[PDB]
Amino acid sequence: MQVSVETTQGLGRRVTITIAADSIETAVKSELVNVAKKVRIDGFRKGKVPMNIVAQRYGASVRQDVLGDLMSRNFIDAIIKEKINPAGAPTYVPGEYKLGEDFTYSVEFEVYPEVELQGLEAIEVEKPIVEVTDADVDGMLDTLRKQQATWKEKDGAVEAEDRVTIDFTGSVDGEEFEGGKASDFVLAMGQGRMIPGFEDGIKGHKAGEEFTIDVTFPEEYHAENLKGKAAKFAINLKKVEERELPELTAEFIKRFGVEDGSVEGLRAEVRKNMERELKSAIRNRVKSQAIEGLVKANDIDVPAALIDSEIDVLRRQAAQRFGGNEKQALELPRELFEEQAKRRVVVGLLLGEVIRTNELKADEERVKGLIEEMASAYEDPKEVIEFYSKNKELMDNMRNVALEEQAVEAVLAKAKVTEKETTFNELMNQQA
Amino acid sequence: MQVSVETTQGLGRRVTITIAADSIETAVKSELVNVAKKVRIDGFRKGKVPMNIVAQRYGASVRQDVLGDLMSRNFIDAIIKEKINPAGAPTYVPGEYKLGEDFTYSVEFEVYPEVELQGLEAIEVEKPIVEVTDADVDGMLDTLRKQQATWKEKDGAVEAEDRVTIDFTGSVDGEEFEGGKASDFVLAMGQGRMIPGFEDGIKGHKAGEEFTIDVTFPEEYHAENLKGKAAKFAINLKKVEERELPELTAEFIKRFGVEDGSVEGLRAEVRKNMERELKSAIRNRVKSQAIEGLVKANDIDVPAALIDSEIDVLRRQAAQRFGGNEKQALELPRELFEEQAKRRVVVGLLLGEVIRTNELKADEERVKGLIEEMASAYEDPKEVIEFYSKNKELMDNMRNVALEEQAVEAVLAKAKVTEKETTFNELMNQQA
């Protein structure tokens, strides 16, 4: 067997393997008649038609199953002789497969080092002490009243402080940007604006008079063919709708689903929101400050295999969002995926080390109250707790999440906890 | 959300869950803004463009993520309140997703029955008593030179007992069909017979003729829209080759792959091949006798969920080979999938119950010896066993196969063991 273990750097090593033509071919014939025998579909029956011709002439489909086995078939043997152990999964980077010659592929595996964390006390824990008094309730209620100010058909030009119901669609330098356009787009004021140029074209003209704008995408834009390329957008200026407050009437209150219809019912729906919004935002802030603190305490050098696995999931899933086209993945900037990925894998090493060596058990009290809180998001809390209590694989997942939280907590209580007073507004204004 | 359970058939409990239009759309906007903020692909940036219009107008490309979440989201609560749970996995039978509508999907499954094996004494174990003597080697050797004789170019009429390397293609009923054609298809004699009309047509014509044979596919054939339809096969008699025996010449010894050239090397390579195939034959004979013993003696009630799992693996794998056409999967007569699946699920329950209740542990010496036996095939056997010993993920699968064979053995030694003498030829005659 043709194998070549190269070293890239430290953790990473590039084991380049080449499988011979007939070594592939015989394996195709083998797995053809195998899967044919078990699934009862031997073309006709189990005594005719040599899989030799089936493979060579029209066995490009089965070649996925075959090469799928052969990558791990040559791997499993080669790693025995050389003592090669990947960190979870090896990054199989293939160049090309010539049909009827060989199959060369670069097996870029990483090794998992023993992680250690330092600066546990040096980490700043934020407790954003928000206590949502009627100042915060009615302050945010006024923010709601003024920001959700009703729509009204403006007579004139578009401006910064207007909504406009339009659409944008066309091409970027002659290419159809797959799903990157909104037929009947609502441009709403008050919130942030899009790329300088786009919204500028919109607010450069009056309603009714429809035209195309040509704006180049930023190099900060998250697709290689769209960024730097000029983009023509067929702007159909239909309806310019200004925001203005008539009053906080039951007509407005009704649009939040308030059956009671009165503003006092609006406060009550807002209390039901404020319950899970306040709890999850506080928990998000202390969790965020913790995770940021852990990584910033120890920006460790993680195995790239875990990053690559995260990147495969994130590339396929992103490209699924961009029309489902695989090719789109390969033109999203890698470092926008490696953002969440790096943090996921670093925290995976750190918190894993914590629950392992600090011997953190699924603390029955901690996971009890955790389950009670997520159950109080459902209609019947008590019975959700009671059913989870029986269920094995639920209590596996509840063990893990209680231990993620408990691993954060082990270093959280060890860290510089700072109980800092803020308001409901500041809590979510500093987020999105 | 709305849930409603209905008994399909006994264990089959159709939990029909109506997910309301808004229950979908809100979860769509959720998974949109989530994936946007974590991957930082918010179109432009994390402060613009409501996910409302993104969902409603072109949010088809997130319905995998959304419905993928909702399948567990609605189900997890539904099973809590009412008491209701699948054996392994629930079969989600969904409606066609019309947008701006309640997605009602039939969440079917079967509950797990107490599996028991019976008629252990009635199960007759076949121990086919064979040896690799020069009698069996010369028997197979004579069959080898007498069956696998060299080919000569024939100019004349084709028989059933000729070779003919033809390129056939055409159309079934008038419609072109994928996969069912082969350029330089070798109709070799000696081995079994093809479908009636086809090979009868080939042998009904003399070398040089380019014609067509319109033959009807059997109603027993492995696909619906092909079976029962006549099929015009444009047979171009390309190569016609007569089957003739010269001798077991050094020309032939080389052609078999034996570089050694002298017949002593043909015998050596035959000893190595006969070694591993004798092992795999005896293994397959006692294994298949025992497996079909347990299954055909105990046609137990198996939860359809396990069948769906196996069938999804088998339909992916098969339809990938049938041009990658996932629609054609559902078109294959399902009993060909359920053939293997029935065996896998019944064995999985029976042998599972054996190793569980009888406390069958992966015996270190037994799994070690099993690995010696299979590693014999590999490049360095005792180092294979040695390296495997470290890797738990692989030793998990080695524990699987060890306990499957050990569970077979726990009933094998209990079953009516009958030693039945055979030759090497008769051992594989039916199996091949």
**In a mutagenesis test of the B interface, which of A1, A42, A45, A58 is the best target, namely the one with the most B β-carbons within 10 Å?**
A58
Q: How far apart are CA A302 and CA A145, in angstroms?
A: 48
Partner residue opposite A191 with nearest CB, options B48, B195, B323: B48
CB A158 within 8 A of CB A209: no
Q: How far apart are CA A430 and CA A278, in angstroms?
A: 14
Q: How far apart are CA A309 and CA A333, in angstroms?
A: 16
Residue with tokens 């050094």: B250
Q: How far apart are CA B368 and CA B142, in angstroms?
A: 37
Q: How far apart are CA B195 and CA B216, in angstroms?
A: 9
Contacts of A75 (CB under 8 A, 6+ apart): A15, A17, A90, A107
CATH of the domain at B177: 3.10.50.40
Cβ–Cβ contact B100 with A under 8 A? no
Contacts of A409 (CB under 8 A, 6+ apart): none
CB B65 within 8 A of CB B36: no
Strands A162-166 and B182-187: unpaired
Positive or negative, the Cα torsion across B32, B38, B40, B45? Answer: positive
Q: How far apart are CA A383 and CA A245, in angstroms?
A: 45
Residue of A nearest to B65 (CA): A317
Q: How far apart are CA A249 and CA A289, in angstroms?
A: 40
Write the CA distances from A13 to A70, A84, A303, integer angstroms: 20, 9, 11
Q: How far apart are CA B117 and CA B291, in angstroms?
A: 12
User: What phi-psi label fits residue A360: left (phi over 0), alpha (psi between -120 and 50 degrees) or beta?
Assistant: beta
Looking at the fold, whether B377 and B257 belong to one and the same domain comes out as yes
Does A323 contact B39 at a Cβ distance shorter than 8 Å?
A: no
Length of chain A in terms of residues written: 432
Does B378 contact A77 at a Cβ distance shorter than 8 Å?
A: yes
Partner residue opposite A61 with nearest CB, options B48, B184, B323: B323
CB B186 within 8 A of CB B255: no
Q: Which of residues 253-292 of A touch B (CB under 8 A)?
A: none
Q: At what angle do helices A392-412 and A381-390 cross, to 10 degrees?
A: 100
How far is B81 from chain A, CA to nearest CA, in Å?
Answer: 7
What single-letter DSSP state applies at residue A362?
-
Residues of B in contact with A50 (CB under 8 A): 186, 188
Which residue(s) pair with A105 in the sheet? A17
CB A352 within 8 A of CB A346: no
Count up the domains in chain B and report the number. Answer: 3
Q: Which amino acid is at B195?
A: I
Partner residue opposite A47 with nearest CB, options B37, B192, B388: B192
Looking at the fold, whether B77 and B116 belong to one and the same domain comes out as no
Strands B416-421 and B124-129: parallel
Does A39 contact B318 at a Cβ distance shorter than 8 Å?
A: yes
Q: How far apart are CA A27 and CA B167, in angstroms?
A: 24
Cβ–Cβ contact A348 with B under 8 A? no
Q: How far apart are CA A222 and CA B40, in angstroms?
A: 9
Q: Which of residues 123-182 of A touch B (CB under 8 A)?
A: 179-182
Positive or negative, the Cα torsion across B26, B27, B33, B36? Answer: negative
Query: To which H or E segment does residue A4 belong?
Result: strand A2-9
- Establish how many alpha carbons lie within 13 A of residue A31's alpha carbon, considering only the half-sphere containing its beta carbon: 21
Determine whether B255 is exposed, middle or buried from the number of CB atoms within 10 Å of its CB (0-12, 13-18, 19+): exposed
Q: How far apart are CA B91 and CA B306, in angstroms?
A: 9
Residue with tokens 């393997």: A17
Q: How far apart are CA A236 and CA A165, in angstroms?
A: 9
CB B398 within 8 A of CB B388: yes
Q: How far apart are CA B354 and CA B413, in angstroms?
A: 13
Determine whether A109 is exposed, middle or buried from the number of CB atoms within 10 Å of its CB (0-12, 13-18, 19+): buried
Residue of B nearest to A42 (CA): B222
**In a mutagenesis test of the B interface, which of A61, A64, A194 is the best target, namely the one with the most B β-carbons within 10 Å?**
A61
Looking at the fold, whether B12 and B139 belong to one and the same domain comes out as no
Partner residue opposite B64 with nearest CB, options A41, A320, A339: A320
Q: How far apart are CA B329 and CA B314, in angstroms?
A: 9
Give the number of other CB atoms < 10 A from CB of residue A123. Answer: 22
Residues of B in contact with A38 (CB under 8 A): 340
Write the CA distances from A274 to B153, B311, B316, integer angstroms: 87, 47, 47
Question: In chain B, helix, strand, coil percent, each to 5?
Answer: 45, 20, 35
Q: How far apart are CA A339 and CA B390, in angstroms?
A: 34
Residue of A nearest to B310 (CA): A39
Residue with tokens 């308001």: A423
CA angle A101, A104, A109 (to 5 degrees): 165
Partner residue opposite B41 with nearest CB, options A45, A57, A336: A336
Q: Which of residues 57-76 of A touch B (CB under 8 A)?
A: 57-58, 61-62, 64-65, 76
Strands B91-94 and B12-19: unpaired
CB B298 within 8 A of CB B346: yes
Select from B39, B1, B21, B3 the least CA-distant residue to B97.
Answer: B21
Domain hosting residue A72, numbered range: 2-110
Positive or negative, the Cα torsion across A391, A392, A397, A399? Answer: positive
Q: How far apart are CA B284 and CA B295, in angstroms?
A: 16
Query: To which H or E segment does residue B212 belong?
Result: strand B210-216
Residue with tokens 């979908």: B24
CB A242 within 8 A of CB A154: yes
Q: How far apart are CA B403 and CA B363, in angstroms?
A: 9
Q: How far apart are CA B150 and CA A222, in angstroms?
A: 62
Q: Strand, coil or helix: what is B360?
A: coil
Does B77 contact A384 at a Cβ distance shorter than 8 Å?
A: yes
Quick one: how far is CA A12 from the chain centroid? 26
CATH of the domain at B34: 3.30.70.1050
Find the DSSP H helices in B218-299.
250-255, 263-297
Looking at the fold, whether B252 and B348 belong to one and the same domain comes out as yes
Does A317 contact B65 at a Cβ distance shorter than 8 Å?
A: yes
Q: How far apart are CA A251 and CA A212, in angstroms?
A: 38
Q: At what angle do helices B63-82 and B21-39 cross, to 10 degrees?
A: 120
Looking at the fold, whether B256 and B315 belong to one and the same domain comes out as yes
Q: How far apart are CA B169 and CA B235, in angstroms?
A: 7
Partner residue opposite A39 with nearest CB, options B77, B336, B383: B336
Q: How far apart are CA A24 and CA A99, in angstroms?
A: 10
* Beta-sheet strands, E only, within A138-288: 150-153, 162-166, 170-172, 185-187, 211-216, 230-235, 239-244
Give the number of other CB atoms < 10 A from CB of residue A431. Answer: 12
Q: How far apart are CA B59 and CA B28, in angstroms?
A: 7
Does A182 contact B57 at a Cβ distance shorter than 8 Å?
A: yes
* Beta-sheet strands, E only, within B116-175: 124-129, 151-153, 163-172
Select from A346, A364, A345 the least CA-distant residue to A403.
Answer: A364
Looking at the fold, whether B98 and B238 belong to one and the same domain comes out as no
User: What phi-psi label fits residue B197: left (phi over 0), alpha (psi between -120 and 50 degrees) or beta?
Assistant: left
What DSSP letter does each residue of A56-99 carry, written as one string?
A: HHH-TTTHHHHHHHHHHHHHHHHHHHHT---SSS-EEE---EET
Q: How far apart are CA B139 and CA B46, in angstroms?
A: 77
Q: How far apart are CA B50 and CA B43, in angstroms?
A: 11
Phi, psi of B81, deg, nearest 5: -60, -40
Residues of A in contact with B58 (CB under 8 A): 179, 181-183
Q: How far apart are CA A305 and CA A309, in angstroms?
A: 6
Q: How many CB pairs under 8 A join A and B?
A: 147
Q: How far apart are CA B158 and CA B155, in angstroms?
A: 9
Q: How far apart are CA B205 and CA A122, in angstroms?
A: 90
Does A383 contact B80 at a Cβ distance shorter than 8 Å?
A: yes
Phi, psi of A95, deg, nearest 5: -80, -75
Q: How far apart are CA B119 and CA B298, in angstroms?
A: 8
Cβ–Cβ contact A322 with B under 8 A? yes
Positive or negative, the Cα torsion across A223, A228, A230, A235? Answer: positive
Quick one: how far is CA B249 from the chain centroid? 39
Strands B210-216 and B230-243: antiparallel
Determine whether A189 is exposed, middle or buried from the number of CB atoms within 10 Å of its CB (0-12, 13-18, 19+): middle
CB A158 within 8 A of CB A205: yes
A193-210: buried (b, 16+ CB within 10 Å) or exposed (e) per residue?
bbbebbbebbbeeebeee
Residue with tokens 């004494």: B121
CB A61 within 8 A of CB A54: no
CB B76 within 8 A of CB B18: no
What DSSP letter does each residue of A103-161 carry, written as one string?
A: EEEEEEE----------TTTSEEEEEE----HHHHHHHHHHHHHHTPEEEE--SB--TT
A284-293: buried (b, 16+ CB within 10 Å) or exposed (e) per residue?
ebbeebbbeb
Q: What is the 3-state secondary structure (H, E, C) of B170-205?
A: EEECCECCCCCCEEEEEECCCCCCCCCCHHHHHCCC
Residue with tokens 């066309």: A170
Cβ–Cβ contact B184 with A under 8 A? yes
B113-142: buried (b, 16+ CB within 10 Å) or exposed (e) per residue?
eebebeebeebebbbbebeeeeebbeebbe
Does A83 contact B387 at a Cβ distance shorter than 8 Å?
A: yes
Give the number of other CB atoms < 10 A from CB of residue A126. Answer: 19
Cβ–Cβ contact B392 with A under 8 A? no
Does A61 contact B337 at a Cβ distance shorter than 8 Å?
A: no
Partner residue opposite B320 with nearest CB, options A45, A57, A61: A61
Q: Strand, coil or helix: what is A399?
A: helix
Q: Which of residues 12-41 of A touch B (CB under 8 A)?
A: 35, 38-41
Residue of B nearest to A62 (CA): B321
Q: Which of residues 194-213 of B touch A (CB under 8 A)?
A: 194-195
Cβ–Cβ contact B332 with A under 8 A? yes
Q: Strand, coil or helix: what is B131?
A: coil
Does A44 contact B324 at a Cβ distance shorter than 8 Å?
A: no
Phi, psi of A45, deg, nearest 5: -150, 170
Residue of B nearest to A63 (CA): B321
Residues of B in contact with A321 (CB under 8 A): 35, 41, 61-62
How far is A265 from chain B, CA to nearest CA, in Å?
Answer: 21
Does B61 contact A195 at a Cβ distance shorter than 8 Å?
A: no
Residue with tokens 């030793």: B395
Select from A158, A237, A230 the least CA-distant residue to A200.
Answer: A158
What DSSP letter does each residue of B29-41 carry, written as one string?
A: HHHHHHHHHHHT-
Does B379 contact A77 at a Cβ distance shorter than 8 Å?
A: yes
Q: How far apart are CA B187 and CA B231, in angstroms?
A: 18
Write the CA distances from A134 to A137, A248, A261, B65, B345, integer angstroms: 5, 17, 20, 38, 62
Question: Structure tokens of A282?
Answer: 């506080």
Residue of A nearest to B54 (CA): A182
CATH of the domain at B429: 1.10.3120.10
How far is B133 from chain A, CA to nearest CA, in Å?
Answer: 27
Partner residue opposite A179 with nearest CB, options B61, B77, B394: B61
Q: How far apart are CA B194 and CA A48, in angstroms?
A: 7
- Establish how many alpha carbons lie within 13 A of residue B117's alpha carbon, considering only the half-sphere containing its beta carbon: 30
Which residue(s) pair with B129 in the sheet? B421
Phi, psi of B103, deg, nearest 5: -80, 90
Residues of A in contact with B166 (CB under 8 A): none
B57-91: buried (b, 16+ CB within 10 Å) or exposed (e) per residue?
bbbebbbebbbeebbebbbebbbbeeebebbeebb
Does B182 contact A54 at a Cβ distance shorter than 8 Å?
A: yes
Q: At what angle do helices A263-297 and A134-147 cross, to 10 degrees?
A: 100
Residues of B in contact with A37 (CB under 8 A): none
Residues of A in contact with B394 (CB under 8 A): 76
Question: Structure tokens of A121?
Answer: 């006390």
Q: How far apart are CA B41 and CA A334, in angstroms?
A: 12
Strands A91-93 and A102-109: antiparallel
- Establish how many alpha carbons lie within 13 A of residue A283's alpha carbon, considering only the half-sphere containing its beta carbon: 10
Phi, psi of B107, deg, nearest 5: -85, 85
What single-letter DSSP state applies at residue B206?
B
Looking at the fold, whether B180 and B258 belong to one and the same domain comes out as no
Residues of A in contact with B183 (CB under 8 A): 57
Residue of B nearest to A41 (CA): B222
Q: How far apart are CA B427 and CA B432, in angstroms?
A: 9
